Ligand binder design. Structure first.
Ligand code: G4P
Length: 299
């Protein structure tokens, strides 16, 4: 009676696989693989998908389906960033994947991904009352409102940690004024999503890094993190810490901080901070499950 499923997310830089199955009522992850192909390389400036990248990605996709079929998972979905939509060869690519790897890839919007992530949260955390999943990412953050497995509304804010960090922070670490204009802005933009909620669930690399931080979880374990709480205080404690030091010292002194995140992580912490303010809340619940797991959730 056991049914196994798998999901494959083709990101702008990574490709991920996740096969799982359902006993009676429980769903569990049996494997998680991921490889960097950087399929998104120079897409914006060239309006093209580099052939070698496409080549590298396709090989991995096959490498992946080898496992899918292996576990004979009778249900497989594959999605891709819409970022690749700016490439003329985007459809051509999608085509090749179809016959060369025998795989149907659905490009999805930043809102759709929000919807998927939200679903992963409804199953892994079973939130109560009105819930708002806040998925802060590198390109942008999505606020997803709903009840149970029902999605009310999804709003996607252009507030990408990278550009947001390039704009307001001109020094590493930044100056007090900079941090101030940063929050004025955050305020303006965030007041737009303000809605009455009961439980705010936190998502993304920044906030799970923050949990590991707060709970002294070094070798990353997604059980000592998932479902953990993060009061406004614990969060403000760490914003304060980092703000006082340059991206590098954060990387050096704190093992859970990925060099790639080390810098931008300030603004990321900021968003979560100001959000609790606007939504007037003392804390939020952190989730290790997101898009990749949310896709599987759908059945
Ligand atoms: N370890 C590692 N991870 C990488 C690297 N590059 C990207 N990632 C992770 O993979 C996702 C971003 O790239 P993709 O896989 O292409 O996904 P995407 O195009 O939809 O953004 C994010 O995972 P995420 O945490 O689920 O989303 P996020 O909130 O950080 O954005 C990001 O942190 C890398 O070089 N090393």
């Amino acid at each position: 009676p056991i049914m196994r499923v798998a999901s494959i997310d083709i990101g702008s830089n990574s490709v991920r696989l996740t096969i799982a199955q359902i006993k009676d009522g429980k769903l569990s992850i049996i494997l998680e693989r991921g490889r960097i192909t950087s399929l998104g390389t120079k897409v914006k400036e060239t309006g093209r998908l580099q052939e070698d990248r496409i080549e590298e990605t396709i090989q991995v996709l096959k490498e992946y389906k080898k496992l899918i079929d292996e576990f004979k998972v009778e249900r497989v979905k594959a999605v891709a960033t819409e970022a690749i939509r700016r490439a003329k060869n985007a459809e051509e690519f999608l085509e090749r994947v179809k016959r060369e790897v025998g795989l149907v890839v659905e490009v999805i919007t930043p809102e759709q991904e929000g919807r998927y992530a939200y679903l992963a949260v409804a199953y892994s955390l079973k939130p109560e009352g009105e819930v708002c999943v806040v998925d802060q990412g590198g390109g942008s953050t999505e606020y997803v409102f709903g009840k149970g497995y029902k999605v009310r509304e999804v709003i996607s804010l252009p507030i990408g940690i990278v550009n947001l960090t390039e704009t307001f922070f001109k020094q590493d670490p930044p100056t007090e004024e900079e941090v101030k204009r940063f929050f004025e802005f955050l305020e303006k933009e965030l007041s737009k999503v303000k809605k009455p909620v009961d439980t705010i669930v936190g998502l993304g690399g920044t906030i799970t890094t923050l949990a590991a931080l707060e709970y002294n979880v070094y070798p990353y374990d997604p059980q000592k993190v998932h479902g953990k709480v993060l009061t406004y205080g614990q969060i403000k404690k760490w914003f304060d810490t980092f703000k006082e030091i340059p991206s590098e010292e954060r990387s050096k002194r704190f093992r859970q901080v990925e060099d790639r995140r080390a810098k931008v992580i300030l603004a990321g912490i900021g968003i979560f901070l100001k959000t609790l303010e606007i939504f007037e809340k003392d804390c939020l619940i952190v989730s290790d499950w997101g898009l990749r797991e949310g896709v599987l959730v759908s059945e």
